[PDB]
Design a binder for this molecule. Structure first.
Ligand SMILES: COc1cc(Nc2nccc(Nc3c(Cl)ccc4c3OCO4)n2)cc(OC)c1OC
Length: 253
């Protein structure tokens, strides 16, 4: 896939499941140099590592992390993607607590919803939609990555392992809550089991401080117990676009 001579690993920036995550530079003949994220790396686990690239490589969308390639004929085995300068959304927001406007936050949520709209249209169920799995670039563009998280997971998917695009819509509501709360943990210190019982007993997360009521209502819609009643991702995007068109709507809190 990618000639190893074309890759320069600069800084180690994080740690992943199978190894490091690094910032680097990719320069191939005919093409300008670009900034890349690089994951570096059991046999079964090697295919486990590389599967992420194969899935990621099925997708082409501005709100889904772009795969540049892999290094496999050489060692260490690598996966290269575009570089997202601002990292994971939950930590980026915690660092920037209170510092982005409602309209900026809605833009981030819209980018995430578009990503999910695309994946649902491709019949791809994510199963692990959470702000930690959303990456942010220098322009604040949010992209879905990562190809049972109890507090993000729909009640039926927990009970039955029924993962659908409608269970993803539940998870997206949780992401909305995370974004509007600037990266607070869903259900704070409640335990997984407490969360499981709380939801079954009709508890839902309250509006975050300063959260427009219309955004909280959209969260409640995403968290309907009847999965068929939840908005599909096209309706989610359209709702968010409506709010962007009509920012007046967002002042009610
Ligand atoms: C600046 O701080 C951080 C940046 C960052 N950026 C980033 N960008 C693209 C991908 C990625 N992780 C990744 C993923 Cl999620 C899937 C597959 C990959 C990956 O790298 C190549 O193969 N990271 C990421 C940071 O950590 C979240 C970060 O702070 C440490």
């Amino acid at each position: 896939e990618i000639d190893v001579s074309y890759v320069k690993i600069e800084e180690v920036i994080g740690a992943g499941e199978f190894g490091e995550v690094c910032r680097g530079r990719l320069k191939a003949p005919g093409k300008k140099e670009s900034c890349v994220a690089i994951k570096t790396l059991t046999e079964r686990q090697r295919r486990e590592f590389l599967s992420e690239a194969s899935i990621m490589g099925q997708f082409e969308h501005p709100n889904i992390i772009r795969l540049e390639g892999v290094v496999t004929n050489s060692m260490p085995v690598m996966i290269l993607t575009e570089f997202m300068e601002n990292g994971a959304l939950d930590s980026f927001l915690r660092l920037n607590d209170g510092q982005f406007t409602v309209i900026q936050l809605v833009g981030m949520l819209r980018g995430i919803a578009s990503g999910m709209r695309y994946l649902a249209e491709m019949s791809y169920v994510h199963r692990d939609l959470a702000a930690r799995n959303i990456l942010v670039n220098s322009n604040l563009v949010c992209k879905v990555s990562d190809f049972i998280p109890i507090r993000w997971t729909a009640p039926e998917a927990i009970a039955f392992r029924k993962f659908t695009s409608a269970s993803d819509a539940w998870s997206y509501g949780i992401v909305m809550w995370e974004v509007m709360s600037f990266g607070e943990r869903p259900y704070w210190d409640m335990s997984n089991q407490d969360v499981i019982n709380a939801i079954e007993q009709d508890y839902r997360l309250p509006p975050p401080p300063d959260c427009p009521t219309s955004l909280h209502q959209l969260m409640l819609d995403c968290w309907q117990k009847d999965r068929n009643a939840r908005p599909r991702f096209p309706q989610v995007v359209s709702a968010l676009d409506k709010m962007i068109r009509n920012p007046a709507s967002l002042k009610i809190v």
